[PDB]
Amino acid sequence: MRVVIQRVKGAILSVRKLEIISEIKNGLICFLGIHKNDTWEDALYIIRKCLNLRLWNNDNKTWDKNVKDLNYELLIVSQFTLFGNTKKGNKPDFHLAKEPNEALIFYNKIIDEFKKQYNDDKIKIGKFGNYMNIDVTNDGPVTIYIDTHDI
Amino acid sequence: MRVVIQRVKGAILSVRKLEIISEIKNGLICFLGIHKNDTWEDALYIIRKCLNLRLWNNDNKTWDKNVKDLNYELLIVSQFTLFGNTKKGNKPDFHLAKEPNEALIFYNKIIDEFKKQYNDDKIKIGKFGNYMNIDVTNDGPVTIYIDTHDIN
Ligand SMILES: NCC(=O)N[C@H]1[C@@H](O)[C@H](n2cnc3c(N)ncnc32)O[C@@H]1CO
Ligand SMILES: NCC(=O)N[C@H]1[C@@H](O)[C@H](n2cnc3c(N)ncnc32)O[C@@H]1CO
């Protein structure tokens, strides 16, 4: 499983009816990619990293507060393009991405778990399998990458 | 070298005078991280992929046009946080980043090479070593990740 985590001041997510369906204020936007062989343990790792990663400062020191400490939000967005393999040519190859129908069911379980480990109000999502327009205010910017297959 | 590429309809980047210092319309925002071990060839790989990756559709086929074909822009944003190591705990560790002063010089060369391979009016940047506020309209979204240390 792969994620790209960006720290934001706000993010506005729109799709065709454009029409807003999701917004957060301060927090994290997480672009989430599900590998065909991802397991539930891969998901858990991403969930707790997303929720406990210390991407904000204290007055005292840097990198010392996470999203929960600040009561901030998370906008989780499905991104199959993280498995866009560009090693062979300039046409990205998406072979490694779990196929959409299963990846949907897996995605919804992950969202369910994000909520259980934090709060229903705090987890926003996109619209899986649709075109999305996302207005983000990148705060830094801060951008973090995790691939669970590295452990 | 590490890069996160995102396809955008627009991006306004501002810093403390916060005033606007860079703006693009349709194109790519590239979050660019320099490893302490990167050589000029790491850079060349990244530049090539950024400029040539086919992240837009043609009328009759997907993943078939690059930023150049469409005459679109790129906003290049320096990002040491891409080496945020989180294997050990929940405090990210950034030791793999190239040291800032040398990194700026490297970064500046990369930007110039970007200007070379495309058009200096279509290449735009942020403010290395400074807090930046970037208003991005993500178009898709479409996010690509490349670590040169996985390749060659
Ligand atoms: N361009 C925006 C977009 O990525 N759209 C993707 C995802 O929202 C979703 N999707 C399908 N498979 C996956 C997967 N393995 N992981 C994450 N999302 C998936 O289905 C869309 C087209 O495949
Ligand atoms: N928060 C946004 C940010 O990351 N700002 C970084 C980069 O703009 C730049 N910088 C320093 N070292 C590097 C490096 N090794 N690679 C890329 N950029 C660097 O210096 C800022 C603080 O170190």
DSSP B48: H
Cα B147 to its chain centre, rounded Å, is 12
CB atoms within 10 A of CB A69: 12
Determine whether the shortest distance from the Cβ of A80 to ligand 1 is under 6 A: yes
By the CB < 8 Å criterion, does A54 face chain B?
A: yes
For chain A, what are the domain ranges?
Answer: 1-151
Sequence-distant (6+) residues with CB within 8 A of A93 are: A84, A85, A86
List chain A residues with CB under 8 Å of B131.
140
From the alpha carbon of B126, which atom of ligand 2 is closest?
8
Residue of B31, B86, B145 lying closest to A141 (CB–CB): B31
* Residue among B80, B81, B108, B110 to mutate when testing ligand 2 (max atoms within 8 A of CB): B80
Q: Check: CB of residue B142 under 8 Å from CB of residue A81.
A: yes
Going from the Cα of A77 to the center of ligand 1, the distance in angstroms, rounded, reads: 9
CB contact under 8 A, B49 and A77: no
Give the CA distances from residue B151 to residues A76, B42, B146, in Å, rounded to whole numbers and listed in that order.
29, 9, 9
- Architecture field, domain B1-152: 3-Layer(bba) Sandwich (3.50)
CA distance A83 to chain B (A): 8
CB atoms within 10 A of CB A83: 20
Dump the DSSP string for A36-82. Answer: TT--HHHHHHHHHHHHH---B--SS-SS-B-TTTTT-EEEEEE-GGG
Q: Collapsing DSSP states into helix, strand and coil, what is residue B109? A: helix
The continuous run of DSSP H or E covering B29 comes out as: strand B27-33
- Single out the residue of A124, A140, A113 nearest to residue A41, CA to CA: A113
From the alpha carbon of A131, which atom of ligand 1 is closest?
2
Domain spanning A1-151: CATH superfamily: D-tyrosyl-tRNA(Tyr) deacylase (3.50.80.10)
Task: Tell me which method was used to determine the 3D structure.
Answer: X-ray
List chain B residues with CB under 8 Å of A91.
54, 63-64
CB contact under 8 A, B137 and A139: no
Q: What is the resolution of this structure in A?
A: 2.1
Sequence-distant (6+) residues with CB within 8 A of B80 are: B33, B34, B94, B97, B98, B100, B103
Q: Which of residues 89-128 of A touch B (CB under 8 A)?
A: 90-92
- Single out the residue of B138, B123, B79 nearest to residue B103, CA to CA: B79
By the CB < 8 Å criterion, does B145 face chain A?
A: yes
Q: Point out which residues pair with B29 in neighbouring strands.
A: B6, B75
B81 belongs to the catalytic site: yes
Sequence-distant (6+) residues with CB within 8 A of B108 are: none
By the CB < 8 Å criterion, does A21 face chain B?
A: no
